[PDB]
Amino acid sequence: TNFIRQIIDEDLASGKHTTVHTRFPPEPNGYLHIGHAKSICLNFGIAQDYKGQCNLRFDDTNPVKEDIEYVESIKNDVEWLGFHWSGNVRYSSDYFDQLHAYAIELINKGLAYVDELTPEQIREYRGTLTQPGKNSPYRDRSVEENLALFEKMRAGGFEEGKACLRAKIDMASPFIVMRDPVLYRIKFAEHHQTGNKWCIYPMYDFTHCISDALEGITHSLCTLEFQNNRRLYDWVLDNITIPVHPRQYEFSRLNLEYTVMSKRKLNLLVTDKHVEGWDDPRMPTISGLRRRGYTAASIREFCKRIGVTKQDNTIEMASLESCIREDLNENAPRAMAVIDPVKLVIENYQGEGEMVTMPNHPNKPEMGSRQVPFSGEIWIDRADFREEANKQYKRLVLGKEVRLRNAYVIKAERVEKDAEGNITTIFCTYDADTLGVIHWVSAAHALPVEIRLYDRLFSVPNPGAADDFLSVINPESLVIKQGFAEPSLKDAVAGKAFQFEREGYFCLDSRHSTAEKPVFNRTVGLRDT
RNA sequence: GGGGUAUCGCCAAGCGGUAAGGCACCGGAUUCUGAUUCCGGCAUUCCGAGGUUCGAAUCCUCGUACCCCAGCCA
Ligand SMILES: Nc1ncnc2c1ncn2[C@@H]1O[C@H](COP(=O)(O)OP(=O)(O)OP(=O)(O)O)[C@@H](O)[C@H]1O
């Protein structure tokens, strides 16, 4: 429960409503991100919890920032998260003729006029945060004059910026938004839904309350930066002939540590080619997180955990990562892969090899087992061998023995270094009566596989509050390795988490993998204590 | 000027009856993954100072900090 659900509860009890109807209304000017997932979880979650309805409405009022690519991706992401909207997909543009009729009602009532103060002047006349504004000299035109001028705007008789329609409210209001807000502005831009039918487009505040009202939304849930705007939400609905009056309730937006959510900013990273694209695995976008190997359920859980309050907040990446590790630990089948490999030859070995039976899940016998090959010339991870180290080090030191994963207890004996002091191969012996643990991959049957180790995109926790967020990009956000994996990984499918033992959870990258050369993105590392 | 918020390192519950829970962190047991699982510890204190009350995080003052609003963006 959260403050919003307590309100809905009151509403139902008091008999103010019988059904609850919410809506998720993104503008199609970019791809959805983890922050939006919190609105999706909130809006669609309430609908299903209260057996209500939730609309997916594209708030498409500004054509010069929107594109059809975004509408199809947004729908994709909403479904992938595991949610379904009520009825057909809606668009604010579906209501352009409606919105235009309402503007006329406002004009007819003398509550709206066509102003001609230039874009620079409207700012000058608006006042400041402590000084009231002043009336445009075009404020007292007659209704008859406004109808004429407005139809002229509609007919394309005015150049962009040359005229706009404003609400006649109060230039001295302490609410900056009630200072004669613009309802319509001229944009000769083709719209992704309505083509060139319109050259005048409605503003967010005029469009939002009216759309909610027409869809019979009972509770509009938005983020905190809209509390000031609520005054205009109610003023519009109170002054036009509409039979219902939805109520707006604001919650705090999600800020994630080490990442920027601003679409304006996320678009800079994509536009300037600093990430592969909106769905690059380092992006905090839904599609990015999906490609990274995140599961829709891990995200739904993440929203469940962070809560819904009116408090500004900043969640640590640790919280997100906790969610995904938990999901994958449960459902991810284990496998073996070596990221940085140094060759290890067992001298004592006899034969072209053998076959060990490894479990697909160490703590869940039910998941099955597999027959993995073994031999003398295997592949091991560099960081697992040490010529010398204290008692703490529980891996392969040049003296003692260590158990291979589901195999033999080998024993370090001799090292053969390259010219530059760097080791090239390690020589050891094994006890055959056996079958300090490490993973390995029989060089004989090793599958060459490219690994992509992702790390946080920014090097500061709040790249948002930086003079230039780009200059604070982490150069080690993506470190590409070439390694080897057991041949079973030959049958992996894009977006199927595997837990490379003692490393982390990894998944096949659809964008880069091929037949011989698979590419694995590292979703998340293990709790490396 | 106006509109909001203040409870653990990060989130968060609490609604006059004596500070849940999660992440992180520290131990300790188990483990052929330095994972997982288990065990236990982690707010005498709720922005501060006064006051009301048998009892206040919660009520009433009076301060303080932070966030939002001056797009013909959403
Ligand atoms: N960080 C966030 N946390 C929570 N909810 C968010 C967040 N960002 C956006 N939303 C929610 O998603 C809804 C749709 O957002 P929309 O795409 O219209 O704008 P935006 O993404 O906030 O802005 P921009 O496109 O400039 O980044 C908003 O109604 C809002 O409540």
Side-chain angles (χ1 to χ4, degrees), chain A residues 416-435:
Chain A
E416 177 178 310
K417 297 187 181 63
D418 96 304
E420 293 63 60
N422 294 133
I423 299 137
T424 32
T425 151
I426 304 176
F427 299 82
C428 328
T429 59
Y430 87 105
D431 187 346
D433 183 86
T434 46
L435 83 161

Side-chain angles (χ1 to χ4, degrees), chain A residues 24-27 29 33 35-36 39 222-223 251 253-254 263:
Chain A
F24 174 49
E27 191 204 0
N29 68 318
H33 55 46
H36 292 122
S39 288
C222 55
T223 33
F251 58 94
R253 77 183 300 110
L254 162 68
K263 285 191 213 147

Side-chain angles (χ1 to χ4, degrees), chain A residues 17 23 59 80 199 247 249 273 343 362 384 451 454 462:
Chain A
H17 296 279
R23 109 266 84 118
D59 229 339
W80 178 82
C199 70
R247 295 306 173 170
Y249 295 100
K273 334 293 293 157
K343 175 145 283 189
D384 288 322
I451 301 166
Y454 296 106
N462 178 0

Side-chain angles (χ1 to χ4, degrees), chain A residues 73-101:
Chain A
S73 62
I74 286 168
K75 299 164 61 173
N76 262 214
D77 291 329
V78 177
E79 292 187 291
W80 178 82
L81 274 181
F83 291 106
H84 299 294
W85 50 95
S86 165
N88 273 197
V89 162
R90 319 299 168 93
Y91 293 80
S92 290
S93 36
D94 287 345
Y95 316 122
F96 282 169
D97 292 276
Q98 225 67 72
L99 270 2
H100 177 264

Side-chain angles (χ1 to χ4, degrees), chain A residues 260 265 268-269 272 274 457-460 462-476:
Chain A
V260 304
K265 292 201 186 75
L268 194 51
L269 296 172
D272 275 11
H274 291 128
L457 229 201
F458 294 94
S459 64
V460 296
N462 178 0
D467 296 313
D468 175 11
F469 74 116
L470 291 186
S471 59
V472 90
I473 283 182
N474 176 10
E476 297 178 272

